[PDB]
C-alpha cells in the first residue's frame, strides 16, 4: 500500500541544505511552486491542441492558494498535467540529480539560493518553510497518487483514497512553526504581486473563514 523510497544522495543532500539553511528570503518558495504549476498548465494546454480529449478530465486551467490556519498548511493546487507514478518514484529524481548537483556547485561558487529555479529543482525550496510536504497528483494516464516527504533522505508514495481531483496537482506545505506568516492573506498577496504578477493563469487566493 504505502511504499517507501530513498532519495538519490545528491537530492537528499540538497534537501538537508535547504531545510537547515539560515536564509531569510524564504518567500521565493511560493514563486517556485506557482511557476511549476504554470509549466504543468502550459503542458496540458499544449497537448490538448493535438488531442482535445485530454481535457475531459477538466477544462478549467487555474491555480488556487489555500492557507489553513487550523492545520498550519498552505496548499498550492493547479489543474495542470499532473504526474504519474513513474514520475514520482523515479523519473523526476533522475532528471533532478544533475540539476541538484549543478545548483550546489553554484552555491559553493557564491550563487544565491533564490536562483534554485534556474536549475529545475525549485520544488525543493518548499523545505525553506515546510517541515513536511505532501503532493496529491492525478495524471490522465495514471491513478491518483500521494507523495510525501519530511526530508531525512526518504519519501513515500501511495495511491490516494481521498479527493479525487480529476487532473492536476496539490502541493500541501506543512509549515514550520516559525513560518506561519505565509498563512496570512496580506503576506501571500504581497508575494504573488512581487514574484508571480505575469503568470498566465488565474491565481485565486482563498481567504479564511473565522474572524
Ligand atoms: C524537483 N522537481 C522537478 C519535483 C520533484 C518532486 C515533485 C515535484 C517537482 S516539480 C513539479 N511540479 C509539478 C506540477 N505542479 N504539476 C505537474 C508536474 C510537476 N512537477 C514535475 C516537473 N514538471 C515538469 C513539466 C512536465 C511540467 C514540464 O513532487 C515530488 O517530487
Judge if the beta carbon of residue 78 lies within 6 A of ligand 1: yes
**Method for structure elucidation:** X-ray
- Residue 148 pairs in a beta bridge with 134, 156
Alpha-carbon distance of 29 to 117, in angstroms, equals 10
Contact 177, 69 (CB under 8 A): no
What is the DSSP pairing of strand 168-175 with strand 73-78?
antiparallel
Q: Is the CB of 145 under 6 A from ligand 1?
A: no
- CA of 80, closest atom in ligand 1: 16
- Say how far residue 167 (Cα) sits from the centre of its chain: 15
Q: How many CA atoms lie within 13 A of 50 on its CB side?
A: 3
164 preceded by a cis bond (ω within 30 of 0): yes
* CA 83, chain centre distance (Å): 12
**Ligand 1, atom nearest to 149 Cα:** 30
Listed resolution, Å: 2.2
Give the Cα separation of 75 and 33 in Å (integer): 10
Please answer whether residues 21 and 179 qualify as being in contact, where contact means their C-beta atoms are separated by less than 8 angstroms: no
182 to each of 66, 110, 124, 130, how far by Cα in Å? 11, 28, 17, 10
**What is the rounded distance in angstroms from the CA atom of residue 191 to the CA atom of residue 100?**
25
Residue 137, burial from CB neighbour count under 10 angstroms (0-12, 13-18, 19+): buried
Helix (H, G, I), strand (E, B) or coil at 29: helix
Q: Do 29 and 125 meet the contact criterion of CB atoms below 8 Å apart?
A: yes
Q: Report CA(157)–ligand 1 centroid distance (Å).
A: 15
Q: What is the distance in A from the centroid of ligand 1 to the CA of 146? A: 13
- Residue 116's φ and ψ, nearest 5 degrees, are -55, -35
Task: Output the CA–CA distances (angstroms, integers) from residue 97 to 17, 26, 119, 168, 172, in the order listed.
Answer: 15, 23, 10, 24, 23
Residue whose C-alpha cell reads 518514484 in the numeric block: 89
Amino acid at each position: 500500500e504505502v511504499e517507501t523510497f530513498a532519495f538519490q544522495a545528491e537530492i537528499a543532500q540538497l534537501m538537508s541544505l535547504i531545510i537547515n539553511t539560515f536564509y531569510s528570503n524564504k518567500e521565493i518558495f511560493l514563486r517556485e511552486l506557482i511557476s511549476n504549476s504554470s509549466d504543468a498548465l502550459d503542458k496540458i494546454r499544449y497537448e490538448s491542441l493535438t488531442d482535445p480529449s485530454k481535457l475531459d478530465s477538466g477544462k478549467e486551467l487555474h491555480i488556487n492558494l489555500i492557507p489553513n490556519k487550523q492545520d498550519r498548511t498552505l496548499t498550492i493546487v493547479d489543474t495542470g498535467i499532473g504526474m504519474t507514478k513513474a514520475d514520482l518514484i523515479n523519473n523526476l529524481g533522475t532528471i533532478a540529480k544533475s540539476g541538484t548537483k549543478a545548483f550546489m556547485e553554484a552555491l559553493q561558487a557564491g550563487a544565491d539560493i533564490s536562483m534554485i529555479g534556474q536549475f529545475g529543482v525549485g520544488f525543493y525550496s518548499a523545505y525553506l518553510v515546510a517541515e513536511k510536504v505532501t503532493v496529491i497528483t492525478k495524471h490522465n494516464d495514471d491513478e491518483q497518487y500521494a507523495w510525501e516527504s519530511s526530508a531525512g533522505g526518504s519519501f513515500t508514495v501511495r495511491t490516494d483514497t481521498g479527493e479525487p481531483m480529476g487532473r492536476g496537482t496539490k502541493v500541501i506545505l506543512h509549515l514550520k512553526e516559525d513560518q506561519t506568516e505565509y498563512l496570512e492573506e496580506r503576506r501571500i498577496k504581497e508575494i504573488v504581486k512581487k514574484h508571480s504578477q505575469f503568470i498566465g493563469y488565474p491565481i485565486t487566493l482563498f481567504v479564511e473563514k473565522e474572524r
